[PDB]
A paper describes a structure:
3-Aminooxypropionic acid was shown to interact with PLP in the active site of TA_Halhy to form an oxime that mimics the external aldimine of PLP and D-glutamic acid; therefore, successful crystallization and solving the complex’s structure make it possible to identify the functional groups involved in the binding of this specific substrate. We successfully crystallized the TA_Halhy complex with the oxime of PLP and 3-aminooxypropionic acid in the active site. The structures of the holoenzyme and complex with the oxime are well-superposed (RMSD for Cα atoms is 0.31). Differences are mostly observed for the positions of loops. Importantly, the carboxyl group of the oxime of PLP and 3-aminooxypropinic acid is located in the O-pocket, although in fold type IV D-amino acid transaminases the side group of the substrate binds within the P-pocket, while the O-pocket binds the α-carboxyl group of substrates (D-amino acid or keto acid), which forms hydrogen bonds with the functional groups of the active site. In the resulting structure, the carboxyl group of the oxime forms hydrogen bonds with the guanidine groups of Arg28* and Arg179 residues. The Arg90 and Lys241 residues are not involved in the binding of the carboxyl group; the side group positions in all the aforementioned residues remain unchanged. The observed adduct position in the active site of TA_Halhy mimics substrate inhibition rather than the formation of an external aldimine with D-glutamic acid as a specific substrate.
Residue numbers in the entry:
A (entry chain A), B (entry chain A): -1 to 119, 124 to 281
Amino acid sequence: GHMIKYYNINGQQVPVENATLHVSDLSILRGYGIFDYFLAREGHPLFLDDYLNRFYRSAAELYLEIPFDKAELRRQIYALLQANEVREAGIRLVLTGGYSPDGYTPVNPNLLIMMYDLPASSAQGIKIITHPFQRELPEVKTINYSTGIRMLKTIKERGATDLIYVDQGEWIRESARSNFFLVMPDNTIVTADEKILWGITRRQVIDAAREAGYAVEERRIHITELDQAREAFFTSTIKGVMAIGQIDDRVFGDGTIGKVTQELQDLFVGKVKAYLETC
Amino acid sequence: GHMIKYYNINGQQVPVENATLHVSDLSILRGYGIFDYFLAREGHPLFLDDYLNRFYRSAAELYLEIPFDKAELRRQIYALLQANEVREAGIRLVLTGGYSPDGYTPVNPNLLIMMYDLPASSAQGIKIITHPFQRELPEVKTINYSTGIRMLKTIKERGATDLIYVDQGEWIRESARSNFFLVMPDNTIVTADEKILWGITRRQVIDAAREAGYAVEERRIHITELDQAREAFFTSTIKGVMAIGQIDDRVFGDGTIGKVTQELQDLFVGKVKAYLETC
Ligand SMILES: Cc1ncc(COP(=O)(O)O)c(/C=N/OCCC(=O)O)c1O
Ligand SMILES: Cc1ncc(COP(=O)(O)O)c(/C=N/OCCC(=O)O)c1O
Ligand SMILES: [Mg+2]
Ligand SMILES: [Mg+2]
Protein backbone atom coordinates (compact mmCIF):
# COMPACT_ATOMS: atom_id res chain seq x y z
CA GLY A 1 0.00 0.00 0.00
CA HIS A 2 1.20 3.45 1.03
CA MET A 3 4.64 4.84 0.11
CA ILE A 4 7.07 5.44 2.99
CA LYS A 5 6.97 9.25 3.52
CA TYR A 6 8.45 9.59 7.05
CA TYR A 7 11.30 8.48 9.28
CA ASN A 8 11.84 9.55 12.90
CA ILE A 9 15.07 11.24 14.12
CA ASN A 10 15.45 11.86 17.84
CA GLY A 11 11.67 11.62 18.38
CA GLN A 12 10.74 14.00 15.46
CA GLN A 13 8.88 12.67 12.41
CA VAL A 14 10.79 13.92 9.31
CA PRO A 15 10.13 13.43 5.61
CA VAL A 16 12.50 10.73 4.28
CA GLU A 17 14.21 13.38 2.00
CA ASN A 18 15.25 15.33 5.19
CA ALA A 19 16.32 12.32 7.32
CA THR A 20 20.00 13.32 7.67
CA LEU A 21 22.75 13.31 10.36
CA HIS A 22 25.55 15.86 10.68
CA VAL A 23 28.88 14.31 9.63
CA SER A 24 30.26 14.66 13.25
CA ASP A 25 28.06 11.62 14.14
CA LEU A 26 30.20 8.74 15.57
CA SER A 27 28.53 6.10 13.33
CA ILE A 28 29.97 7.98 10.31
CA LEU A 29 33.43 8.69 11.82
CA ARG A 30 33.97 5.65 14.14
CA GLY A 31 31.29 3.05 13.24
CA TYR A 32 29.96 3.44 16.83
CA GLY A 33 26.32 2.41 17.17
CA ILE A 34 23.82 -0.39 17.64
CA PHE A 35 20.62 -1.16 15.70
CA ASP A 36 17.72 -3.54 15.48
CA TYR A 37 15.36 -4.52 12.65
CA PHE A 38 11.92 -6.16 12.79
CA LEU A 39 8.90 -6.59 10.52
CA ALA A 40 5.38 -5.35 11.07
CA ARG A 41 2.35 -7.33 9.76
CA GLU A 42 -1.33 -6.47 10.24
CA GLY A 43 -0.13 -3.13 11.67
CA HIS A 44 1.98 -4.84 14.41
CA PRO A 45 5.76 -5.11 14.78
CA LEU A 46 6.44 -8.85 15.35
CA PHE A 47 7.78 -10.06 18.76
CA LEU A 48 8.26 -6.35 19.47
CA ASP A 49 9.07 -6.65 23.21
CA ASP A 50 11.85 -9.18 22.40
CA TYR A 51 13.39 -6.86 19.76
CA LEU A 52 13.13 -3.76 22.02
CA ASN A 53 14.69 -5.71 24.91
CA ARG A 54 17.61 -6.60 22.65
CA PHE A 55 17.87 -2.97 21.48
CA TYR A 56 18.10 -1.72 25.13
CA ARG A 57 20.70 -4.48 25.96
CA SER A 58 22.75 -3.56 22.84
CA ALA A 59 22.70 0.12 23.83
CA ALA A 60 23.86 -0.66 27.43
CA GLU A 61 26.84 -2.65 26.07
CA LEU A 62 28.05 0.52 24.21
CA TYR A 63 27.16 2.76 27.25
CA LEU A 64 24.67 4.62 24.98
CA GLU A 65 21.50 5.73 26.77
CA ILE A 66 18.35 5.59 24.58
CA PRO A 67 16.64 8.99 25.11
CA PHE A 68 13.13 7.36 25.49
CA ASP A 69 11.99 4.49 27.77
CA LYS A 70 10.73 1.28 26.01
CA ALA A 71 6.98 2.24 26.16
CA GLU A 72 7.78 5.70 24.59
CA LEU A 73 9.92 4.06 21.87
CA ARG A 74 7.06 1.58 21.16
CA ARG A 75 4.71 4.64 20.84
CA GLN A 76 7.10 6.33 18.37
CA ILE A 77 7.26 3.11 16.31
CA TYR A 78 3.42 2.71 16.22
CA ALA A 79 3.03 6.46 15.46
CA LEU A 80 5.45 6.09 12.53
CA LEU A 81 3.49 3.08 11.08
CA GLN A 82 0.32 5.27 11.25
CA ALA A 83 2.10 8.34 9.75
CA ASN A 84 3.26 6.16 6.79
CA GLU A 85 -0.28 4.58 6.64
CA VAL A 86 1.23 1.07 6.41
CA ARG A 87 0.32 -2.21 8.14
CA GLU A 88 3.11 -4.27 6.39
CA ALA A 89 6.70 -2.95 6.81
CA GLY A 90 10.32 -3.41 7.79
CA ILE A 91 11.45 -1.21 10.70
CA ARG A 92 15.08 -0.28 11.54
CA LEU A 93 16.12 1.27 14.86
CA VAL A 94 19.59 2.88 14.95
CA LEU A 95 21.37 4.36 17.99
CA THR A 96 24.66 6.06 17.09
CA GLY A 97 27.34 7.39 19.40
CA GLY A 98 26.08 10.86 18.49
CA TYR A 99 27.63 14.16 17.50
CA SER A 100 31.05 13.86 19.17
CA PRO A 101 33.19 16.93 20.07
CA ASP A 102 36.53 15.14 19.24
CA GLY A 103 35.46 12.51 16.63
CA TYR A 104 35.84 9.70 19.23
CA THR A 105 34.19 10.34 22.67
CA PRO A 106 30.40 9.80 22.66
CA VAL A 107 28.49 12.86 24.12
CA ASN A 108 24.77 12.34 23.13
CA PRO A 109 23.45 9.40 20.95
CA ASN A 110 21.29 9.95 17.82
CA LEU A 111 18.20 7.74 17.59
CA LEU A 112 16.81 6.86 14.12
CA ILE A 113 13.59 4.98 13.27
CA MET A 114 13.47 4.07 9.56
CA MET A 115 10.69 2.21 7.72
CA TYR A 116 10.59 0.10 4.55
CA ASP A 117 8.26 -2.10 2.47
CA LEU A 118 8.13 -5.75 3.67
CA PRO A 119 11.02 -7.72 2.08
CA ALA A 120 9.86 -9.02 -1.38
CA SER A 121 11.97 -12.06 -0.20
CA SER A 122 12.80 -22.79 -6.81
CA ALA A 123 12.82 -25.99 -4.56
CA GLN A 124 16.57 -25.49 -4.01
CA GLY A 125 18.25 -24.31 -0.81
CA ILE A 126 20.73 -21.42 -1.08
CA LYS A 127 24.43 -22.06 -1.77
CA ILE A 128 26.92 -20.63 0.75
CA ILE A 129 30.67 -20.65 1.53
CA THR A 130 32.42 -21.09 4.87
CA HIS A 131 34.56 -18.08 5.85
CA PRO A 132 37.03 -18.01 8.77
CA PHE A 133 36.07 -14.96 10.93
CA GLN A 134 34.74 -14.05 14.40
CA ARG A 135 32.40 -11.03 14.76
CA GLU A 136 33.50 -8.34 17.33
CA LEU A 137 31.20 -8.06 20.44
CA PRO A 138 28.99 -10.72 18.80
CA GLU A 139 26.20 -10.77 21.47
CA VAL A 140 25.74 -6.99 20.80
CA LYS A 141 23.78 -5.93 17.66
CA THR A 142 26.42 -3.33 16.66
CA ILE A 143 26.32 -1.51 13.30
CA ASN A 144 29.72 -3.10 12.41
CA TYR A 145 29.22 -5.21 9.18
CA SER A 146 32.61 -4.45 7.49
CA THR A 147 33.63 -8.09 6.91
CA GLY A 148 30.11 -9.21 5.81
CA ILE A 149 29.84 -6.38 3.23
CA ARG A 150 33.51 -6.60 2.10
CA MET A 151 32.84 -10.35 1.45
CA LEU A 152 29.88 -9.71 -0.98
CA LYS A 153 32.21 -9.69 -4.07
CA THR A 154 34.03 -12.88 -2.86
CA ILE A 155 30.69 -14.66 -2.10
CA LYS A 156 29.44 -13.80 -5.67
CA GLU A 157 32.77 -14.51 -7.53
CA ARG A 158 32.91 -17.98 -5.85
CA GLY A 159 29.34 -18.83 -7.11
CA ALA A 160 27.54 -18.55 -3.69
CA THR A 161 24.88 -16.08 -2.40
CA ASP A 162 25.91 -16.02 1.30
CA LEU A 163 28.46 -17.25 3.87
CA ILE A 164 28.69 -18.92 7.30
CA TYR A 165 31.43 -17.57 9.61
CA VAL A 166 33.69 -20.17 11.26
CA ASP A 167 35.69 -18.91 14.28
CA GLN A 168 39.34 -19.70 13.50
CA GLY A 169 38.00 -22.04 10.72
CA GLU A 170 36.96 -24.46 13.53
CA TRP A 171 33.73 -23.27 15.24
CA ILE A 172 30.55 -22.64 13.20
CA ARG A 173 28.93 -19.33 14.29
CA GLU A 174 26.46 -17.42 12.11
CA SER A 175 26.30 -15.56 8.76
CA ALA A 176 26.73 -11.73 8.68
CA ARG A 177 22.92 -11.42 8.84
CA SER A 178 21.48 -14.83 9.92
CA ASN A 179 21.78 -17.45 12.64
CA PHE A 180 22.74 -20.93 11.45
CA PHE A 181 21.34 -24.35 12.32
CA LEU A 182 22.05 -28.00 11.46
CA VAL A 183 19.65 -30.96 11.65
CA MET A 184 21.40 -34.29 12.26
CA PRO A 185 20.17 -37.57 10.75
CA ASP A 186 18.45 -38.48 14.12
CA ASN A 187 16.57 -35.10 13.78
CA THR A 188 18.62 -33.36 16.52
CA ILE A 189 18.68 -29.58 15.74
CA VAL A 190 22.11 -28.04 16.53
CA THR A 191 23.00 -24.32 16.73
CA ALA A 192 25.92 -22.37 18.27
CA ASP A 193 25.34 -21.09 21.85
CA GLU A 194 28.35 -18.69 22.15
CA LYS A 195 29.88 -15.70 20.31
CA ILE A 196 26.80 -15.20 18.09
CA LEU A 197 23.91 -12.71 18.05
CA TRP A 198 20.88 -14.15 19.84
CA GLY A 199 18.47 -13.77 16.90
CA ILE A 200 14.76 -13.27 17.65
CA THR A 201 14.01 -15.76 14.76
CA ARG A 202 16.54 -18.20 16.31
CA ARG A 203 14.73 -17.85 19.71
CA GLN A 204 11.26 -18.46 18.12
CA VAL A 205 12.49 -21.46 16.07
CA ILE A 206 14.27 -23.07 19.07
CA ASP A 207 11.11 -22.65 21.22
CA ALA A 208 8.84 -24.00 18.42
CA ALA A 209 11.28 -26.95 17.84
CA ARG A 210 11.33 -27.83 21.58
CA GLU A 211 7.50 -27.34 21.89
CA ALA A 212 7.21 -29.85 18.97
CA GLY A 213 9.39 -32.29 21.05
CA TYR A 214 12.58 -32.04 18.92
CA ALA A 215 15.99 -32.33 20.59
CA VAL A 216 17.79 -28.92 20.27
CA GLU A 217 21.45 -28.70 21.24
CA GLU A 218 22.84 -25.16 21.71
CA ARG A 219 26.54 -25.95 21.78
CA ARG A 220 29.88 -25.42 20.05
CA ILE A 221 29.72 -26.90 16.50
CA HIS A 222 32.95 -28.21 14.94
CA ILE A 223 33.33 -27.41 11.17
CA THR A 224 33.65 -31.26 10.62
CA GLU A 225 30.01 -31.67 11.83
CA LEU A 226 28.73 -30.20 8.50
CA ASP A 227 29.45 -33.72 7.13
CA GLN A 228 27.33 -35.46 9.90
CA ALA A 229 24.31 -33.12 9.30
CA ARG A 230 21.29 -34.00 7.11
CA GLU A 231 19.98 -30.39 6.83
CA ALA A 232 21.25 -26.84 7.31
CA PHE A 233 19.22 -23.65 7.51
CA PHE A 234 19.46 -19.94 8.33
CA THR A 235 17.12 -17.93 10.57
CA SER A 236 16.62 -14.15 10.46
CA THR A 237 13.96 -11.51 10.68
CA ILE A 238 13.75 -11.09 6.86
CA LYS A 239 14.41 -14.79 5.86
CA GLY A 240 12.38 -16.49 8.61
CA VAL A 241 13.67 -20.12 8.18
CA MET A 242 15.67 -20.48 4.93
CA ALA A 243 16.95 -23.87 3.67
CA ILE A 244 20.64 -24.11 2.76
CA GLY A 245 21.15 -26.58 -0.15
CA GLN A 246 24.97 -26.41 -0.40
CA ILE A 247 27.92 -25.40 1.83
CA ASP A 248 31.18 -25.34 -0.13
CA ASP A 249 31.21 -28.62 -2.21
CA ARG A 250 28.59 -30.41 0.01
CA VAL A 251 24.94 -30.67 -1.21
CA PHE A 252 22.56 -31.28 1.72
CA GLY A 253 20.38 -34.15 0.44
CA ASP A 254 19.28 -33.31 -3.16
CA GLY A 255 19.66 -29.60 -2.10
CA THR A 256 15.88 -29.16 -1.59
CA ILE A 257 14.49 -28.22 1.88
CA GLY A 258 14.92 -30.97 4.48
CA LYS A 259 12.05 -32.48 6.43
CA VAL A 260 12.75 -30.76 9.77
CA THR A 261 13.64 -27.41 8.12
CA GLN A 262 10.22 -27.46 6.32
CA GLU A 263 8.49 -28.32 9.66
CA LEU A 264 10.30 -25.46 11.45
CA GLN A 265 9.45 -23.03 8.61
CA ASP A 266 5.71 -23.82 9.15
CA LEU A 267 6.11 -23.60 12.98
CA PHE A 268 7.80 -20.18 12.64
CA VAL A 269 4.86 -18.93 10.50
CA GLY A 270 2.68 -20.36 13.34
CA LYS A 271 4.68 -18.36 16.00
CA VAL A 272 4.08 -15.20 13.88
CA LYS A 273 0.34 -15.97 13.56
CA ALA A 274 0.09 -16.71 17.33
CA TYR A 275 1.92 -13.40 18.10
CA LEU A 276 -0.46 -11.40 15.84
CA GLU A 277 -3.49 -13.04 17.61
CA THR A 278 -2.15 -11.38 20.88
CA CYS A 279 -2.14 -7.89 19.31
CA GLY B 1 43.41 32.01 13.30
CA HIS B 2 40.27 31.63 11.20
CA MET B 3 37.22 29.64 12.33
CA ILE B 4 36.40 26.49 10.34
CA LYS B 5 33.43 27.54 8.12
CA TYR B 6 33.47 24.79 5.42
CA TYR B 7 33.68 21.05 4.89
CA ASN B 8 33.58 19.28 1.51
CA ILE B 9 30.99 16.57 0.65
CA ASN B 10 31.37 14.74 -2.65
CA GLY B 11 33.53 17.56 -4.09
CA GLN B 12 31.15 20.42 -3.00
CA GLN B 13 32.26 22.94 -0.36
CA VAL B 14 29.41 23.18 2.21
CA PRO B 15 29.07 25.28 5.35
CA VAL B 16 29.79 23.06 8.40
CA GLU B 17 26.12 23.53 9.59
CA ASN B 18 24.92 21.82 6.32
CA ALA B 19 27.53 19.00 6.22
CA THR B 20 25.04 16.10 6.54
CA LEU B 21 24.52 12.58 5.08
CA HIS B 22 21.16 10.92 4.45
CA VAL B 23 20.56 8.15 7.01
CA SER B 24 20.66 5.45 4.21
CA ASP B 25 24.48 5.90 4.22
CA LEU B 26 26.27 2.56 4.96
CA SER B 27 28.61 4.14 7.57
CA ILE B 28 25.48 4.93 9.66
CA LEU B 29 23.69 1.59 9.07
CA ARG B 30 26.62 -0.90 8.68
CA GLY B 31 29.80 0.92 9.84
CA TYR B 32 31.14 0.50 6.27
CA GLY B 33 33.84 3.04 5.41
CA ILE B 34 37.49 4.01 5.57
CA PHE B 35 39.09 7.31 6.62
CA ASP B 36 42.39 9.07 7.06
CA TYR B 37 43.51 12.02 9.21
CA PHE B 38 46.55 14.29 8.85
CA LEU B 39 47.69 17.71 10.08
CA ALA B 40 48.50 20.76 8.02
CA ARG B 41 51.21 23.25 9.15
CA GLU B 42 52.39 26.36 7.29
CA GLY B 43 49.45 25.77 4.90
CA HIS B 44 50.66 22.21 4.00
CA PRO B 45 49.19 18.82 4.91
CA LEU B 46 52.14 16.81 6.35
CA PHE B 47 53.49 13.75 4.43
CA LEU B 48 50.39 14.20 2.26
CA ASP B 49 51.33 11.72 -0.50
CA ASP B 50 51.87 8.97 2.15
CA TYR B 51 48.45 9.64 3.75
CA LEU B 52 46.65 9.80 0.35
CA ASN B 53 48.36 6.56 -0.74
CA ARG B 54 47.05 4.89 2.42
CA PHE B 55 43.58 6.37 1.80
CA TYR B 56 43.49 4.89 -1.76
CA ARG B 57 44.78 1.49 -0.44
CA SER B 58 42.13 1.51 2.35
CA ALA B 59 39.39 2.26 -0.18
CA ALA B 60 40.53 -0.60 -2.51
CA GLU B 61 40.37 -3.08 0.41
CA LEU B 62 36.62 -2.23 0.86
CA TYR B 63 36.07 -2.18 -2.98
CA LEU B 64 35.05 1.52 -2.65
CA GLU B 65 36.16 3.68 -5.59
CA ILE B 66 37.14 7.26 -4.58
CA PRO B 67 35.29 9.50 -7.09
CA PHE B 68 38.43 11.73 -7.68
CA ASP B 69 42.02 10.72 -8.60
CA LYS B 70 44.77 11.56 -6.02
CA ALA B 71 45.80 14.91 -7.67
CA GLU B 72 42.10 16.05 -7.71
CA LEU B 73 41.65 15.01 -4.06
CA ARG B 74 44.86 16.92 -3.14
CA ARG B 75 43.35 19.99 -4.96
CA GLN B 76 40.10 19.68 -2.97
CA ILE B 77 42.09 19.48 0.28
CA TYR B 78 44.23 22.58 -0.57
CA ALA B 79 41.09 24.44 -1.77
CA LEU B 80 39.39 23.66 1.57
CA LEU B 81 42.41 25.00 3.60
CA GLN B 82 42.15 28.24 1.53
CA ALA B 83 38.32 28.42 1.89
CA ASN B 84 38.71 28.13 5.72
CA GLU B 85 41.67 30.64 5.54
CA VAL B 86 43.80 28.38 7.79
CA ARG B 87 47.45 27.30 7.58
CA GLU B 88 47.33 25.14 10.80
CA ALA B 89 44.63 22.38 10.88
CA GLY B 90 43.58 18.79 11.32
CA ILE B 91 42.06 17.21 8.19
CA ARG B 92 39.80 14.11 8.11
CA LEU B 93 38.98 12.20 4.91
CA VAL B 94 36.01 9.79 5.10
CA LEU B 95 34.81 7.39 2.39
CA THR B 96 31.57 5.61 3.31
CA GLY B 97 29.86 2.75 1.53
CA GLY B 98 27.32 5.31 0.34
CA TYR B 99 23.55 5.52 0.10
CA SER B 100 22.65 1.82 -0.17
CA PRO B 101 19.35 0.60 -1.71
CA ASP B 102 19.00 -2.36 0.77
CA GLY B 103 20.94 -1.10 3.86
CA TYR B 104 23.84 -3.50 3.08
CA THR B 105 25.10 -3.51 -0.58
CA PRO B 106 27.35 -0.53 -1.42
CA VAL B 107 26.14 1.36 -4.61
CA ASN B 108 28.06 4.73 -4.61
CA PRO B 109 30.50 5.90 -1.81
CA ASN B 110 30.17 9.30 -0.06
CA LEU B 111 33.41 11.28 0.25
CA LEU B 112 33.79 13.74 3.17
CA ILE B 113 36.64 16.21 3.81
CA MET B 114 36.38 17.72 7.31
CA MET B 115 38.72 20.29 8.90
CA TYR B 116 39.60 21.16 12.51
CA ASP B 117 41.93 23.35 14.58
CA LEU B 118 45.37 21.75 15.22
CA PRO B 119 45.17 19.46 18.29
CA ALA B 120 45.80 21.61 21.46
CA SER B 121 47.66 18.35 22.48
CA SER B 122 54.25 17.30 33.20
CA ALA B 123 57.54 15.24 32.79
CA GLN B 124 55.51 12.03 33.18
CA GLY B 125 54.65 9.54 30.44
CA ILE B 126 50.99 8.52 30.06
CA LYS B 127 49.55 5.56 32.00
CA ILE B 128 47.91 2.80 29.95
CA ILE B 129 46.37 -0.68 30.39
CA THR B 130 46.86 -3.81 28.30
CA HIS B 131 43.63 -5.08 26.71
CA PRO B 132 43.24 -8.45 24.94
CA PHE B 133 41.79 -7.68 21.45
CA GLN B 134 42.68 -7.88 17.73
CA ARG B 135 41.39 -5.15 15.36
CA GLU B 136 39.38 -6.39 12.29
CA LEU B 137 41.14 -5.83 8.88
CA PRO B 138 43.93 -4.08 10.84
CA GLU B 139 46.07 -3.01 7.81
CA VAL B 140 42.96 -1.13 6.51
CA LYS B 141 42.11 2.29 8.08
CA THR B 142 38.40 1.38 8.50
CA ILE B 143 35.97 3.58 10.45
CA ASN B 144 35.41 0.66 12.92
CA TYR B 145 36.46 1.90 16.45
CA SER B 146 33.73 0.10 18.51
CA THR B 147 36.09 -1.63 20.96
CA GLY B 148 38.38 1.43 21.38
CA ILE B 149 35.41 3.74 22.17
CA ARG B 150 33.52 1.14 24.28
CA MET B 151 36.76 0.81 26.35
CA LEU B 152 36.93 4.59 27.24
CA LYS B 153 34.91 4.08 30.50
CA THR B 154 37.05 1.00 31.48
CA ILE B 155 40.34 2.86 30.69
CA LYS B 156 39.18 5.82 32.93
CA GLU B 157 37.65 3.68 35.78
CA ARG B 158 40.95 1.69 36.01
CA GLY B 159 42.99 4.96 36.42
CA ALA B 160 44.60 4.98 32.90
CA THR B 161 44.20 7.37 29.91
CA ASP B 162 44.72 4.84 27.08
CA LEU B 163 45.28 1.15 26.22
CA ILE B 164 47.55 -1.14 24.17
CA TYR B 165 45.79 -4.05 22.41
CA VAL B 166 47.34 -7.51 22.87
CA ASP B 167 46.22 -10.16 20.34
CA GLN B 168 44.91 -13.08 22.41
CA GLY B 169 46.68 -11.43 25.44
CA GLU B 170 50.00 -12.62 23.89
CA TRP B 171 51.05 -10.35 20.97
CA ILE B 172 51.46 -6.58 21.47
CA ARG B 173 49.80 -4.68 18.57
CA GLU B 174 48.76 -1.03 18.80
CA SER B 175 46.32 1.23 20.72
CA ALA B 176 42.92 2.13 19.15
CA ARG B 177 44.53 5.31 17.76
CA SER B 178 48.35 4.94 18.01
CA ASN B 179 51.17 2.60 17.01
CA PHE B 180 53.25 1.25 19.89
CA PHE B 181 57.02 0.93 20.33
CA LEU B 182 59.46 -0.43 22.93
CA VAL B 183 63.11 0.55 23.44
CA MET B 184 65.21 -2.24 24.96
CA PRO B 185 68.08 -1.56 27.38
CA ASP B 186 70.64 -1.97 24.47
CA ASN B 187 68.63 0.82 22.66
CA THR B 188 67.00 -1.60 20.16
CA ILE B 189 63.62 -0.09 19.09
CA VAL B 190 60.93 -2.81 18.72
CA THR B 191 57.47 -2.47 17.10
CA ALA B 192 54.90 -4.98 15.75
CA ASP B 193 55.15 -5.73 11.99
CA GLU B 194 51.82 -7.61 11.51
CA LYS B 195 48.07 -7.09 12.11
CA ILE B 196 48.49 -3.35 12.87
CA LEU B 197 47.78 -0.15 10.91
CA TRP B 198 50.95 1.09 9.20
CA GLY B 199 50.92 4.56 10.80
CA ILE B 200 52.50 7.45 8.85
CA THR B 201 54.09 8.61 12.21
CA ARG B 202 55.35 5.03 12.76
CA ARG B 203 56.91 5.08 9.22
CA GLN B 204 58.61 8.49 9.83
CA VAL B 205 59.92 7.46 13.29
CA ILE B 206 61.28 4.09 12.02
CA ASP B 207 63.06 5.87 9.11
CA ALA B 208 64.45 8.61 11.43
CA ALA B 209 65.56 5.92 13.98
CA ARG B 210 67.35 3.88 11.25
CA GLU B 211 68.87 7.07 9.66
CA ALA B 212 70.24 7.86 13.18
CA GLY B 213 71.83 4.32 13.19
CA TYR B 214 69.48 2.74 15.78
CA ALA B 215 68.58 -0.96 15.50
CA VAL B 216 64.80 -1.23 14.73
CA GLU B 217 63.15 -4.64 14.87
CA GLU B 218 59.69 -4.89 13.25
CA ARG B 219 58.60 -8.24 14.63
CA ARG B 220 56.07 -10.05 16.80
CA ILE B 221 56.34 -8.75 20.42
CA HIS B 222 55.44 -11.13 23.27
CA ILE B 223 53.50 -9.46 26.18
CA THR B 224 56.39 -10.69 28.49
CA GLU B 225 58.80 -8.36 26.62
CA LEU B 226 57.24 -5.30 28.36
CA ASP B 227 59.42 -6.38 31.34
CA GLN B 228 62.68 -6.45 29.20
CA ALA B 229 62.00 -2.92 27.76
CA ARG B 230 63.53 0.31 29.13
CA GLU B 231 61.09 2.66 27.32
CA ALA B 232 57.67 2.52 25.66
CA PHE B 233 56.05 5.12 23.43
CA PHE B 234 53.10 5.72 21.11
CA THR B 235 53.19 7.27 17.62
CA SER B 236 50.26 8.93 15.84
CA THR B 237 49.40 11.87 13.66
CA ILE B 238 48.05 13.94 16.62
CA LYS B 239 50.51 12.67 19.35
CA GLY B 240 53.68 12.55 17.23
CA VAL B 241 55.96 10.53 19.64
CA MET B 242 54.37 10.25 23.11
CA ALA B 243 56.20 8.70 26.10
CA ILE B 244 54.38 5.98 28.05
CA GLY B 245 55.34 6.12 31.77
CA GLN B 246 53.30 3.12 33.01
CA ILE B 247 51.71 -0.04 31.53
CA ASP B 248 49.53 -1.82 34.08
CA ASP B 249 51.65 -1.93 37.35
CA ARG B 250 55.02 -1.34 35.55
CA VAL B 251 56.62 2.16 35.64
CA PHE B 252 59.11 2.60 32.77
CA GLY B 253 62.16 4.09 34.53
CA ASP B 254 60.95 6.92 36.85
CA GLY B 255 57.99 7.29 34.36
CA THR B 256 59.58 10.33 32.63
CA ILE B 257 60.47 10.19 28.89
CA GLY B 258 63.29 7.76 28.09
CA LYS B 259 66.48 8.78 26.32
CA VAL B 260 65.68 7.20 22.93
CA THR B 261 62.00 8.28 23.03
CA GLN B 262 63.16 11.93 23.58
CA GLU B 263 65.66 11.56 20.66
CA LEU B 264 62.95 10.14 18.37
CA GLN B 265 60.52 12.92 19.39
CA ASP B 266 63.11 15.53 18.22
CA LEU B 267 63.84 13.51 15.02
CA PHE B 268 60.10 13.34 14.22
CA VAL B 269 59.85 17.16 14.59
CA GLY B 270 62.90 17.20 12.23
CA LYS B 271 61.05 14.96 9.66
CA VAL B 272 58.10 17.44 9.81
CA LYS B 273 60.43 20.44 9.35
CA ALA B 274 62.26 18.68 6.45
CA TYR B 275 58.86 17.86 4.82
CA LEU B 276 57.68 21.51 5.11
CA GLU B 277 61.00 22.69 3.49
CA THR B 278 59.93 20.59 0.38
CA CYS B 279 56.58 22.41 0.10
C1 LIG C 1 24.91 -10.94 12.99
C2 LIG C 1 23.48 -11.38 12.91
N1 LIG C 1 23.19 -12.60 13.35
C3 LIG C 1 21.92 -13.04 13.30
C4 LIG C 1 20.88 -12.32 12.78
C5 LIG C 1 19.47 -12.85 12.87
O1 LIG C 1 18.82 -12.08 13.95
P1 LIG C 1 17.20 -11.87 13.92
O2 LIG C 1 16.90 -11.06 12.65
O3 LIG C 1 16.59 -13.28 13.78
O4 LIG C 1 16.87 -11.20 15.24
C6 LIG C 1 21.14 -11.02 12.32
C7 LIG C 1 20.03 -10.26 11.74
N2 LIG C 1 20.16 -9.10 11.27
O5 LIG C 1 19.00 -8.72 10.55
C8 LIG C 1 19.00 -7.29 10.46
C9 LIG C 1 18.23 -6.82 9.25
C10 LIG C 1 18.92 -6.99 7.91
O6 LIG C 1 19.92 -7.70 7.84
O7 LIG C 1 18.45 -6.39 6.92
C11 LIG C 1 22.46 -10.53 12.37
O8 LIG C 1 22.79 -9.29 11.92
C1 LIG D 1 44.38 1.90 14.64
C2 LIG D 1 45.40 2.99 14.50
N1 LIG D 1 46.68 2.64 14.61
C3 LIG D 1 47.64 3.58 14.48
C4 LIG D 1 47.38 4.91 14.28
C5 LIG D 1 48.52 5.87 14.04
O1 LIG D 1 48.50 6.16 12.59
P1 LIG D 1 49.09 7.58 12.05
O2 LIG D 1 48.19 8.67 12.66
O3 LIG D 1 50.51 7.71 12.64
O4 LIG D 1 49.08 7.46 10.54
C6 LIG D 1 46.05 5.32 14.15
C7 LIG D 1 45.78 6.74 13.96
N2 LIG D 1 44.62 7.22 13.86
O5 LIG D 1 44.65 8.63 13.96
C8 LIG D 1 43.43 9.13 13.37
C9 LIG D 1 43.06 10.47 13.95
C10 LIG D 1 42.48 10.46 15.35
O6 LIG D 1 42.57 9.43 16.02
O7 LIG D 1 41.92 11.50 15.77
C11 LIG D 1 45.03 4.35 14.26
O8 LIG D 1 43.71 4.68 14.17
MG1 LIG E 1 12.87 -32.35 -1.59
MG1 LIG F 1 63.66 11.82 33.23
